[PDB]
Every structure is written in C-alpha cells, then in structure tokens.
C-alpha cells in the first residue's frame, strides 16, 4: 500500500532533497583527475554532518561501508569509495547521495565527466539524463508507472543503449526504500496509478552495451557483464495536483523544478 505525504512532511522532503542536491553541487570542484573516490567520500560526509547537520542514509544501510556511492565507467552502481581508486582523464563517474534530515530522506545522483570528455561517455550521460527528464515530464496524477517505465526504455533502446533491469526507482520518505517500485522499462507486473502527495525517485541505469550485470566479490560493487560503460541520474520528486515538483533539483539541471501541465 503506497502512502501519501502531508504538507508538513513534503516541506521536510524539500529540505532533505535540497541538502542531497547541495552535496552534489559542493563536490563538483573536487571531481578532477588524480582524486581518489575515498577522499571525495570523506569530503561529502564531513559536509553532510558538520555543515548540513544531517546524516548519510547510505552509511550502514544493509551494512554499506561508506557515506556515498561512487561508480566509475563500467561500474553500474554501489561503487565503494576507496583511498586508492583514483579518477583519470576520460572517466565518467556517478556520485550517489542520500541524506536524512529531520527524519526524511533526499535521494539523488548525477554523472561527472572527468578531464577531456569522450564523445561516447558524453553521449551516454546526456541520453541517460534525458531519459530521466522525459519520465519526469510524464509525472502527474492518473498516469500509470508502467507508461513511464515504457517510455524510458523505448527512448534508451532507440539510442542503441540498454536499461538495467535489476535496480529501480522507489517510494521514499521516513524510509530509504518504500513502495512503490519504479521500473525504468515496461513490465506486466507494474500497475501503479500516481496520486497527489506520492514521493518517489526515478533513477534509470543505462548501459552502452548489454543490460546484463555482475556483482563483484566485495558484495557491493556492480559492473556491466560485458564491461561496457554505464550511467545513471536520479531525482526525488513529489507528485502534485497536475504534475510534480523535483525536490533534488540542482543549479546545473536543465529542467524546471516545478513541472506544470
């Protein structure tokens, strides 16, 4: 049973969402060749705790060891920050942030292109973000999640890319992952009609190559089976009366915070 949020709770979601977004805005300057994913994590955690007076929702979740997930190139998600893993020219990197503030969660992520961008890493990130934007434009009461998943997949595959099946968007509030599940592809199992007040995430994972993925033996790191590049972008939203409001919008986003139909 999916739950609706109250006006007060939604305001708290705006705050946690903004904080999540601001972590990504803060870290951007440090995302350069030579930096380790470990340092970036410590920077993010220090900021979340000492500046935002919030806490990382990832730290300890199901035993997660770090504060943010950092995934590079062929790594699909849940990449673990490490003091020896350095970023280099050409790399595409996702920093996945989740913060809890005043009891509510804010969840978002984006891609960063390191050094000189390559046409393909550049193209994969742009298409991935557009697939998120396209889905965000469909959000309004009355529409079924299945349609949104359908549209993301059709857009993505038309570009020669593939949509990761194992992971999905999700309801969010006082809990990290609440109902419903938000698939980024068409599924006969999906039947959820949006309603005002619902809060969830949209976070498509797109592979340049095949959809198949393999988990590493650290029990967390997920890579593409064919070792092709993978990209992801995420935003937390609240369904409004005639559309939705992006709670994790950043200065660099090129979509309106409030989407009115």
Ligand X SMILES: NNC(=O)c1ccc(-c2ccccc2Cl)o1
CB of 183 to Mn ion, least distance (A): 13
C-alpha to C-alpha distance for 94 and 96, rounded to whole angstroms: 6
Q: Determine if 71 is a binding residue for Na ion (CB under 5 A).
A: yes
64 touches, from ligand X, Mn ion, Na ion, none (C-beta below 5 to 8 Å by class)? ligand X
Q: Which is nearer to Mn ion, 201 or 240 (CB)?
A: 201
Q: Which residue has the tokens 């009115």?
A: 260
Closest-by-Cβ residue to ligand X is 64
Residue 9 vs 234, nearer CB to Mn ion: 234
* CA atoms of 33 and 39, how far apart (whole Å): 13
Q: Evaluate whether 241 touches 197 at the Cβ level (below 8 Å).
A: no
What's the closest the beta carbon of residue 199 comes to ligand X, in angstroms? 13
What do you get for the CA distance between the two ends of the chain, in Å? 27
Nearer to Mn ion, 107 or 245 (CB): 107
Helices (H), 66-210: 119-136, 145-157
Helix axes 7-27, 37-46, angle to 10 degrees: 140
Which of 22, 74, 107, 253: binder of Mn ion (CB under 5 A)?
107
Residue 212 annotated as binding site: no
Cα angle 195, 198, 140 (rounded to 5 degrees) comes to: 45
For Na ion, the closer CB: 56 or 94:
94
Give the separation between CA 24 and CA 68, rounded to whole angstroms: 10
Q: What is the closest distance, in whole angstroms, from the C-beta atom of residue 236 to Mn ion in the complex? A: 8
Distances (CA, A) of 79 to 72, 225, 250: 8, 15, 23
Chain positions contacting ligand X, by CB under 6 A: 58, 61-62, 64, 69, 96, 98, 107, 109, 203, 234
Instruction: Look up residue 52 and give its two tokens.
Output: 């935002």
The verdict on whether residue 78 carries a ligand-binding annotation is yes
CA distance 236 to 16: 10
Whether 105 has a binding-site annotation, put simply, is no
Residue list 201-220, contact with Mn ion (CB under 5 A)? 201
Which residues contact residue 22 at a Cβ distance below 8 angstroms, ignoring those fewer than 6 apart?
Answer: 52
Site string for Na ion, 224-243 (x = CB under 5 A): ------x-------------
Residue 62 or 251: which CB sits closer to ligand X? 62
- Provide the binding-site residues for Mn ion, judged by CB under 5 A: 107, 201
Binding-site residue positions: 78, 96, 98, 107, 170, 177, 203, 234
Binding stretches for Na ion (CB under 5 A): 71, 75, 230
């Amino acid at each position: 049973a999916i739950s609706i949020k109250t006006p007060e709770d939604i305001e708290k979601m705006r705050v946690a969402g903004r904080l999540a977004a601001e972590v990504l805005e803060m870290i951007e300057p440090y995302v350069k060749p030579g930096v380790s994913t470990g340092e970036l994590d410590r920077i993010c955690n220090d900021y979340i705790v000492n500046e935002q007076h919030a806490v990382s929702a990832c730290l300890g979740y199901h035993g997660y060891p770090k504060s943010v997930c950092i995934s590079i190139n062929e790594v699909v998600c849940h990449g673990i920050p490490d003091d020896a893993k350095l970023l280099k020219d050409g790399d595409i990197v996702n920093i996945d942030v989740t913060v809890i503030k005043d009891g509510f969660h804010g969840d978002t992520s984006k891609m960063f292109i390191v050094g000189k961008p390559t046409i393909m890493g550049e193209r994969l990130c742009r298409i991935t973000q557009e697939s998120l934007y396209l889905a965000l434009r469909m959000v309004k009461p009355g529409i079924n999640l299945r349609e949104i998943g359908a549209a993301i997949q059709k857009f993505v595959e038309a570009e020669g890319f593939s949509v990761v099946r194992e992971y999905c968007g999700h309801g969010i509030g006082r809990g990290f992952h609440e109902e419903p599940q938000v698939l980024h592809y068409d599924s006969r199992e999906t039947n959820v009609v949006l309603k005002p007040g619902m809060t969830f995430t949209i976070e498509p994972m797109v592979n340049a190559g095949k959809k198949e993925i393999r988990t590493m033996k650290d029990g967390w790191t997920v890579k593409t089976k064919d070792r092709s590049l993978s990209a992801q972008y995420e935003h937390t939203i609240v369904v409004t009366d005639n559309g939705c409001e992006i709670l994790t919008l950043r200065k660099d986003d090129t979509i309106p915070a409030i989407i009115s139909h």
